[PDB]
Design a protein that fits this description.
Number of domains of chain D: 1
Shape of chain A: globular
Family (chain C): Belongs to the universal ribosomal protein uS15 family.
Order of helices and strands of chain D: EHEEEHE
Protein name (chain C): Small ribosomal subunit protein uS15
Largest interface: B-D, 12 and 12 residues
Distance between the termini of chain D: 14 Å
Oligomer: part of a larger assembly
Radius of gyration of chain A: 15 Å
GO molecular function (chain C): rRNA binding; structural constituent of ribosome
Structural class of chain A: alpha/beta
Keywords (chain C): Ribonucleoprotein, Ribosomal protein, RNA-binding, rRNA-binding
Chains: A alpha/beta, B mainly alpha, C mainly alpha, D alpha+beta
Number of strands of chain D: 5
Largest sheet of chain A: 5 strands, mixed
Shape of chain D: globular
Distance between the termini of chain A: 51 Å
Number of helices of chain A: 3
Subunit structure (chain C): Part of the 30S ribosomal subunit. Forms a bridge to the 50S subunit in the 70S ribosome, contacting the 23S rRNA.
Strand content of chain A: 25-35%
Radius of gyration of chain D: 13 Å
RNA sequence: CGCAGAUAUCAGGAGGAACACCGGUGGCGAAGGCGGGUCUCUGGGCAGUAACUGACGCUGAGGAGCGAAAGCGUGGGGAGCGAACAGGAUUAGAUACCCUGGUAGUCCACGCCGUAAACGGUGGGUACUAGGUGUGGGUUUCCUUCCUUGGGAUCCGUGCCGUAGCUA
């Protein structure tokens, strides 16, 4: 089918960054990721790799018929605002911006300390 | 007209300032329950968290009953916590 | 817990006159009441150690008072024991 | 005896026309124990902070009972076992 | 781990530990130690009057009781974490730090043991012995509007600076 407006879920972490589209209902249409663009290993946390990922996923969205997009960003992101700017360049209207970051109210235990 | 301090023209005033404030007991507050959302939400941040005494001005007595009523309000859903 | 009316009861019955409060007899009676009440509390709540410490303290002061009373006059000591039904 | 502030939330499927007596049906059991002077308010259809069982609003109410602890805890047992309440709560009006 | 359709995403449901901001040289407790909320049962503490009894006080060999985490026993429960254990990897070799998985255990009930940097590394109790300084609790006259870190004075508890004095 096709859909004119949706949202975009932007999960940015230390070792990767995956940026997918969705209808506001939660059904995805086309996604892209930093390792899938071609990069490998630790190369795929620098925000240039997020530029590339967001670019490909947004152009798929255009191919499906999306023009205006919300954004829901999640995680420690080297390229959050990088990805957002590249999305807003590559043919999208950023409707709404949010910091949806899953915080627990002092819940489950975390792992130990590293060195 | 005068300085913030060292104004011997007047009585030692009943004023609240940047460091000093006593915001519940003094005025602006009717009664301390979870049922009165409007007086409570003023003592929060924009995003649902809770303020600190060193910014507000309250004594621990007051801050803690405030926090209590806020938290009871969150459990009766009169007042929002942050969730999807 | 120990209400003012329970205190009135004890201070009327074992209290020498309707005003005395510090007297050994009255003080022992109040502490014995408190101690039986708390013992019944502990029958159920077996882990309230913070309360058992208070119990041991109140028992300490109670034996102190009984012992002072015995130093003073054995007659009144034993008559108090007999009246309260206690053993020691 | 002791005072309280019993809060209750019910589903909007019920109606204001029938709110007040539904409480009374329970409260009679207290009323026939202590001559329990009650002072009751009804305000509902209020939006919530977050959905309980796919509900956006509820029926709030404040039943200031002046009764004994056994009876209020029994009332809470009844209220919770009822099928309509979303929540309820019992704060003591005295110093604790 | 996936390519048998993962991760991602969205609705619902199951679940069992820990309660973000409040929350800190900050309060309580003899000490260990104590924070999601409501109820119930109970304990000590401070202040004011100082009505009341009239030295009953202080300590305490032994003794009894309490006492972190780990460990033990019986039952249940087990999401996350995770010794041991397994594999990958750096390495002279790495039975270790790193990564991926993971058992007991951590969790509740009831009985145990009775140890720690259980540290203020200063045993307890009472009094005298320059102050200044924040900060917590309850009293109270003064400028008093009398709504106030108002200020003053007393009581308790707490952290920093500082003479005498003491100390290698």
């Amino acid at each position: 089918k096709n859909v004119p407006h949706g949202a975009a879920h932007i999960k940015s972490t230390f070792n990767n960054t995956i940026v997918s589209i969705t209808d506001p209902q939660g059904n995805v249409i086309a996604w892209a990721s930093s390792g899938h663009v071609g990069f490998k290993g630790s190369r795929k946390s620098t925000p240039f790799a997020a530029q590339l990922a967001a670019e490909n996923a947004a152009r798929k969205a255009q191919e499906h018929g999306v023009k205006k997009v919300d954004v829901f960003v999640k995680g420690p992101g080297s390229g959050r605002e990088t990805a957002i700017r590249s999305l807003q360049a590559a043919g999208l209207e950023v409707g709404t911006i949010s910091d949806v970051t899953p915080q627990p109210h002092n819940g489950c235990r975390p792992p130990k300390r590293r060195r | 007209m005068m300085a913030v301090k060292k104004s011997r023209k007047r009585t030692a005033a009943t004023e609240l300032k940047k460091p000093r404030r006593n915001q519940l007991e003094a005025l602006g507050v009717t009664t301390i329950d979870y049922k009165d959302v409007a007086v409570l939400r003023t003592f929060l941040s924009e995003r649902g968290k809770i303020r600190s005494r060193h910014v507000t001005g309250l004594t621990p007595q007051q801050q803690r009953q405030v926090a209590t009523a806020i938290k009871n309000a969150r459990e009766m859903a009169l007042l929002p916590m942050a969730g999807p | 817990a120990l209400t003012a009316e329970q205190k009135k009861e004890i201070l009327g019955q074992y209290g020498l006159h309707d005003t005395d409060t510090g007297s050994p007899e009255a003080q022992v009676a109040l502490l014995t009441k408190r101690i039986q009440d708390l013992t019944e509390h502990l029958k159920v709540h077996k882990h309230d150690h913070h309360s058992r410490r208070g119990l041991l303290l109140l028992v300490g002061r109670r034996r102190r008072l009984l012992k002072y009373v015995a130093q003073v006059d054995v007659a009144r000591y034993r008559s108090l024991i007999e009246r309260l039904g206690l053993r020691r | 005896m002791r005072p309280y502030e019993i809060m209750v939330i019910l589903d909007p499927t019920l109606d204001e026309r029938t709110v007040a007596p539904s409480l009374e049906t329970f409260l009679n059991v207290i009323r026939k124990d202590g001559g329990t002077v009650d002072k009751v308010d009804i305000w509902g259809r209020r939006r919530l902070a977050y959905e309980i069982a796919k509900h956006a609003e509820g029926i709030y109410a404040v039943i200031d009972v002046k009764a004994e602890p056994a009876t209020v805890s029994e009332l809470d047992r009844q209220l919770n076992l009822n099928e309509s309440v979303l929540r309820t709560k019992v704060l003591r009006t005295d110093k604790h």
